[PDB]
Design a protein around this nucleic acid. Structure first.
Lengths: 56, 209, 119, 114, 123
RNA sequence: GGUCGGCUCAUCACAUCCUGGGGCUGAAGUAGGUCCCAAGGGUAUGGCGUUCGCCAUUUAAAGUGGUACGCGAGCGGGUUUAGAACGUCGUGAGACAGUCGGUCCCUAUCUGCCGUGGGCGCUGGAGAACUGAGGGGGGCUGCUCCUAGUACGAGAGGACCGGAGUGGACGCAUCACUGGUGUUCGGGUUGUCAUGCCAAUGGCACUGCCCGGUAGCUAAAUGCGGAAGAGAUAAGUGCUGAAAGCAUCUAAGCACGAAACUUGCCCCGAGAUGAGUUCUCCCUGACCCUUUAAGGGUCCUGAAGGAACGUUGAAGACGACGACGUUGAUAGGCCGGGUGUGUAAGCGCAGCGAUGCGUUGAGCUAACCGGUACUAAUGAACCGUGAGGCUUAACCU
RNA sequence: AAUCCUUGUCGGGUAAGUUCCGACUGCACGAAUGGCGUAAUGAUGGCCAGGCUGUCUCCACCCGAGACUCAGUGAAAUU
RNA sequence: CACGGUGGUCAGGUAGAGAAUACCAAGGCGCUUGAGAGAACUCGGGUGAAGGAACUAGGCAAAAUGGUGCCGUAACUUC
RNA sequence: AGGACCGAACCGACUAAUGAAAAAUUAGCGGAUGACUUGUGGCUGGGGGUGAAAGGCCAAUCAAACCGGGAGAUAGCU
């Protein structure tokens, strides 16, 4: 139910070893608009694999 | 004696002329082909390594390709070893067929069972459920006690508990071999053998017999 | 476990789920493009496309069936008079998913689902 | 699969007549006793059919010697010699399990004419 | 699929209408008795003047079950009620002289040959 | 400054209940008695707060103990609060191991255990297949038949040894069958609201109430298992054989001997840091720099392979594992089939009508089967480098 | 018996009944701190039967809410 | 605490004995974290072969019964 | 007619499982023309009240309420 000894700061650190985030490996560049975006997602302007899939 | 690497096709049934229905697992045993022949001198033991099936030339890797190339054989879906007995010779390119099983009466089929995932003790270990009523509080399928007080003051190793169930190698033994069909590359053995449809199966002649 | 099982539950009971698919599909039909969570969008393909298929063969019975499925007459009309003859030639694949990042309020992955012959 | 199908079809009988639920059928079955095969009939109402090619079955119910008896024949088994429809019944269900809790006059099933 | 506390009907003419199973014989922990399986029974309801009498503890052999029996071809035979034939505790041959209702090929053996002979229909 | 019993889970001892091996017997046989070895596995359901016990019916057997009289941070009949009463004791308040009612909390830090990953290591890197140090699982037993109504015995009765079948309990797998489930399929039907109304549909009433039921998952369903064999032994039996002219199973030597032990069967397993083996694949460039060594740095270079992203899976809590990514069937859709339901709607006929009949085994049909690029799986980018230390030996020249 | 010995003994009920019902040496019933009966009534105590059933043999599957993962917020006992 | 308690008045429709219940009107709301996933286990539900109290201290809990009309209804009774 | 019966409101709280809640929930359960229930106001005060009696209740407090005072009670105890 509850601890008998305050765990150390070292212990805490160890525990949070794995808590670290992974940055996106590399963004993709759209062939037409030249603007960066996540793989397989449309761009902010609304291009995907060249063609303008959605109007702004 | 060596074994073969089939694939589980499905189950069906063979009616006998006598009246009896025999429940069979259809194992498709396409031509297993030798890749490597190990020995006491180089590798430290006699065995053959075989492959089977096809594989995408674009999805077989370089090292994999090279191994196959050396053998002088097509790239199959895997590699499997079989220890050789005294007086069992095999050449490297050689293709073994289900024809091999025509003489045998029983087989040990081996394969990876279906995966139940995280299973509780009731499913995994046949633990008896606790009472469904009569006051029982939040403890119907829970595993009950797991030890003794103070001595030993620890749970013993191997305690039966919940956990990953299935998706593991299992060998059924002494399955009677009903039909060897060299034409259609089939082997019918009586009874259920492990794993799902499409799964690889290692068939061997039965060790106990 | 769920070996070989179809369908997303979507943390809803069955009736509710059905309702939402009816609505969502209808909306899609109306607008030819909607933004929605990705899983939901995926699910929708198996409601809308069948409706579209049904709409190809124009009959009274078919129309009735469509209505039952959807329950907006306008939507049905759209399906039968516009979309069926538009997709007449097309064998399946009437719709299209387009992943479009992440929703602000709950980091849910969104995606535009749109009819194929929209633009 | 394909292979399985192939295996099955070369075991199926080609002479199974068309019967439905509600029909009164007469199934002749082989019976071994000592060293003499003999044919035993089982007339009754077909309450259920299961269609699964080689694994097709049908369940015939009769009232022998007071006791109600159901018997589930595997349709393509060689233990059944001949199926034969004596009478054809007009019912509106695929399965007449309601007849388990009906007797005599209640368990009548009108004849399917034409 | 008969077990302790299951009430069977009686196929023979020994006197008992209704008997209860109090033990499935032939093994430690043995759960169920099917057809051809000897059970220990108690007589719960009997006719006024029969051979047996109410509250008699004695053996019986199960001859029909509602669960039913499989044959090698995969067929199953079921019945509408679970029935047995009462037997002597020692000799284990039937008390009754006349079997009512159909019985099964499962039952035929040097043990229960009499019963089969008696029976109107063997399925 | 958590004390009975029950349940659930056990684990160990052997002073052994069953099964196994043996000596003696007041052991003819069958069945027993008793002692010795043996802890591999097994070792009952019910009737009447209990443990126990008695009784019923089984069983090969229903072992005896330890484990905080094992187990309440795993789950209240009894004793042991407050209410009430009987008997009894007390003048009385009250009292009695004398006799209806009455709150059982805790989200797990560490150890431990069951599963499952991330890191680094294993000395260039990578992809595979192994060996197997070690560890774990498994090890129960009935009945019937034959041998043989033989041996034995006055009869009654009735074998050892050895073989064959079929069960019980337990375990593993599996879904072909028999079934369960199947709020994602089809249908019936009550009340009510809606779609303008009829007809037809949908909502809500536990899936409104039901009847069927696909795939999956599943047991009651159906396959398989316990072994044989080998080695070394236990008690025990001996062989040859002195010490002790004899005798003696032993002191030298030799042999047999049991579910125990080691193997043999199944699973994990090289973090086995003692970090193993085999096969295959990949990288064969420049110059600075000095605190000159397995040193640091800048340009070029970026392999094998990996990861990531996406479509996903009889894999799965998440990671992981598997499949596939247009040189493509990975998923969805579509086509055909199958399965399920049980003759849709609309129209026509018959009927005063409810309804029936025809079109029509129709319509609709999830997770199935076989196909099909219609939709989605992007050209890339990212990590990973650039021949791999020293010392000895043996070889090659 | 709202009686130690005691699971008294006999009978009934059950295959089997320390409970229950009926009867026969009051450890230590007993007559308004009432005795013995009693129809009706009781979320009252005990016992038996019919029906019913996942209570159980012995669990299986399914539908939802949590648990698990992601994003936002963000406690507690204890030490 | 943006968390159970709180007197009066108003009382539509269809079904119904009804202010019960079900579906609706007028009117008012979706309950101030969402998104996925579809393990164990917990909660709240549904169905279950054969058996049917064998469960348990105890049928606890579930299951079942369930309406109107008519026929019919024992002991015992303070009638 | 009825401290009559079945049954919503209303009053209660026998069984059950389960902080939103310092006693609730959902599912059932009892009474429901009466010794009923309820609103508003009033009265009874601490060895005192009230009590169809449980040592119950008297502001989440009861074998003698709360607040302040005697008061730094006393404590051979921790």
């Amino acid at each position: 139910a509850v601890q008998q000894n305050k765990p150390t700061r070292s212990k805490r650190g160890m525990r949070r070893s794995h808590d670290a985030l992974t940055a996106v490996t590399s963004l993709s560049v759209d062939k037409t608009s030249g603007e960066k975006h996540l793989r397989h997602h449309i761009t902010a302007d609304g291009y995907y694999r060249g063609r303008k899939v959605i109007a702004k | 004696m060596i074994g073969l690497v089939g694939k589980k096709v499905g189950m069906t049934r063979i009616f006998t002329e006598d009246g009896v229905s025999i429940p069979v697992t259809v194992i498709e045993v396409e031509a297993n082909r030798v890749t490597q022949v190990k020995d006491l001198a180089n590798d430290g033991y006699r065995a053959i390594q075989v492959t089977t099936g096809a594989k995408k030339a674009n999805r077989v890797t370089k090292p994999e390709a090279g191994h196959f190339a050396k053998a002088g054989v097509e790239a199959g879906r895997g590699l499997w070893e079989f220890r050789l007995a005294e007086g069992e010779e095999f050449t490297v390119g050689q293709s073994i067929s289900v024809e091999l099983f025509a003489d045998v009466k029983k087989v040990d089929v081996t394969g990876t069972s279906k995966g139940k995932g995280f299973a509780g003790t009731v499913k995994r270990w046949n633990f008896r459920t606790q009472d469904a009523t009569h006051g029982n509080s939040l403890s119907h399928r829970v595993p009950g006690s797991i030890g003794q007080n103070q001595t030993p003051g620890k749970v013993f190793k191997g305690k039966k508990m919940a956990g990953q169930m299935g998706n593991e190698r299992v060998t059924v033994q002494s399955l009677d071999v009903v039909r060897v069909d060299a034409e259609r590359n089939l082997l019918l053995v009586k009874g259920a053998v492990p794993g799902a449809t499409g799964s690889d199966l290692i068939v061997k002649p039965a060790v106990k017999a | 476990m769920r070996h070989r099982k179809s369908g997303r539950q979507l943390n809803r009971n069955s009736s509710h789920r059905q309702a939402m698919f009816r609505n969502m599909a209808g909306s899609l039909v109306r607008h030819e493009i909607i933004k929605t969570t990705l899983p939901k969008a995926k699910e929708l393909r198996r409601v809308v496309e069948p409706l579209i298929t049904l709409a190809k063969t124009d009959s009274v019975a078919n129309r009735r069936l469509a209505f039952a499925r959807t329950r907006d007459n306008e939507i049905v009309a759209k399906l039968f008079n516009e979309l069926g003859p538009r997709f007449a030639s097309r064998a399946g694949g009437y719709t299209r998913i387009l992943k479009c990042g992440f929703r602000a309020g709950d980091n849910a992955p969104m995606a535009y689902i749109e009819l194929v012959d929209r633009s | 699969s394909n292979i399985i199908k192939q295996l099955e079809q070369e075991q199926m009988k080609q002479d199974v007549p068309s019967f439905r639920p509600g029909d009164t059928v007469e199934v002749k079955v082989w019976v071994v006793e000592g060293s003499k095969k003999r044919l035993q009939a089982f007339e009754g109402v077909v309450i259920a059919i299961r269609n699964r090619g080689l694994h097709s079955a049908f369940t015939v119910r009769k009232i022998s010697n007071g006791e109600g008896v159901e018997r589930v024949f595997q349709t393509h088994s060689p233990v059944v010699d001949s199926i034969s429809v004596k009478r054809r019944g007009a019912v509106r269900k695929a399965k007449l399990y309601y007849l388990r809790e009906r007797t005599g006059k209640a368990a009548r099933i009108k004849e399917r004419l034409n | 699929m008969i077990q302790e506390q299951t009430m069977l009907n009686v196929a023979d003419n020994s006197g008992a209408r209704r008997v209860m199973c109090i033990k499935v014989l032939g093994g430690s922990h043995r759960r169920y008795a099917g057809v051809g399986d000897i059970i220990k029974i108690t007589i719960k309801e009997a006719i006024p003047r029969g051979k047996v009498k109410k509250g008699d503890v004695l053996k019986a052999v199960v001859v029909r079950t509602k669960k039913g029996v499989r044959r090698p071809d995969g067929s199953v035979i079921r019945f509408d009620g679970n029935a047995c034939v009462l037997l002597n505790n020692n000799s284990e041959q039937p008390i009754g002289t006349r079997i009512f209702g159909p019985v099964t090929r499962e039952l035929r053996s040097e043990k229960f040959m009499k019963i089969i002979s008696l029976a109107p229909e063997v399925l």
